């Protein structure tokens, strides 16, 4: 039915995500950060974009709404390391949680939402939003499970008119990812499956 590329996408988006709040920056180099999570584990997260280069310094607190690149490890020194990519923002919370205006259209027909979570963070990395949206599409709307649901896009429109969008037939371009956005400044989020 589907082609090998769609199978890669399905595997990536069907899996969950790693979530850690109030993590602390242990080190910040070009393209990566070493973070100590409150539970003890270390997170070594890579940032392949010049447009999104985290400037948090040692000691600063961050939130991780990232995704793992490979299996976690137990090192000889008894440390537990996570290997993730992107998904680092500040710890600012919204006064009250808000539900983002998501509209899905499958083959032109409006498809209702199921289990769409409310958010409480002031800012979320675009990569985080990408998988939240895509995960909803894969688990509730069958995206990537059959050849008749393998294309489309999602578009986020900001209060000021600027838009962000990703092509649902390709993997998210981490390499050119823009900085996290204030979710309370989002006008609409549209997703369409071809």
First CA to last CA distance, the chain: 15
Report yes or no: 152 and 169 within 8 Å, Cβ to Cβ. yes
The dihedrals phi and psi of 78, each to the nearest 5 degrees, come to 70, 30
Domain that includes residue 3, residue range: 1-17+89-194
Q: Are strands 42-46 and 32-36 parallel, antiparallel or unpaired?
A: antiparallel
- Same domain for 2 and 44, yes or no, is no
Of the residues 62, 88, 114, the one at which a domain ends: 88
- Same domain for 23 and 12, yes or no, is no
Determined by which method? X-ray
- Resolution, expressed in angstroms to one decimal: 3.1
How far apart CA 137 and CA 155 sit, in angstroms, is 14
Helix H or strand E encompassing 96: strand 93-98
How far apart CA 130 and CA 77 sit, in angstroms, is 36
Point out which residues pair with 29 in neighbouring strands. 32
CATH number of the domain within which 130 lies: 3.10.20.120
Contacts of 80 (CB under 8 A, 6+ apart): 40, 41, 42, 72, 73, 74
How far apart CA 132 and CA 135 sit, in angstroms, is 5
| Both tokens assigned to 125 | 């990395």
- Same domain for 50 and 10, yes or no, is no
How many domains does the chain fold into? 2
- Same domain for 166 and 83, yes or no, is no
Sign of CA dihedral 15, 17, 163, 156: positive
DSSP state of 174: G
- Same domain for 77 and 139, yes or no, is no
How far apart CA 169 and CA 50 sit, in angstroms, is 24
CB atoms within 10 A of CB 190: 18
Of the residues 61, 88, 115, the one at which a domain ends: 88
Distance of CA 113 to the CA centre of its chain: 19
CATH number of the domain within which 61 lies: 2.40.50.110
């Amino acid at each position: 039915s589907t082609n090998d590329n769609i199978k890669d996408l399905l595997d990536w988006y069907s899996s969950g995500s790693d979530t850690f709040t109030n993590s602390e920056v242990l080190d910040n180099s070009l393209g990566s950060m070493r973070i100590k999570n409150t539970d003890g584990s270390i997170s070594l997260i890579i940032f392949p974009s010049p447009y999104y280069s985290p400037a948090f310094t040692k000691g600063e607190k961050v939130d991780l709404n990232t995704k793992r690149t490979k299996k976690s490890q137990h090192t000889s020194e008894g440390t537990y390391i996570h290997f993730q990519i992107s998904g680092v923002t500040n710890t600012e919370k919204l006064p009250t949680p808000i539900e983002l205006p998501l509209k899905v259209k499958v083959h032109g027909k409006d498809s209702p939402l199921k289990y769409w979570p409310k958010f409480d963070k002031k800012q979320l990395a675009i990569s985080t939003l990408d998988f939240e949206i895509r995960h909803q599409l894969t688990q509730t709307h069958g995206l990537y499970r059959s050849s008749d649901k393998t294309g489309g896009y999602w578009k986020i429109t900001m209060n000021d008119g600027s838009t962000y969008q990703s092509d649902l037939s390709k993997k998210f371009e981490y390499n050119t990812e823009k900085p996290p956005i204030n979710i309370d400044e989002i006008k609409t989020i549209e997703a369409e499956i071809n």
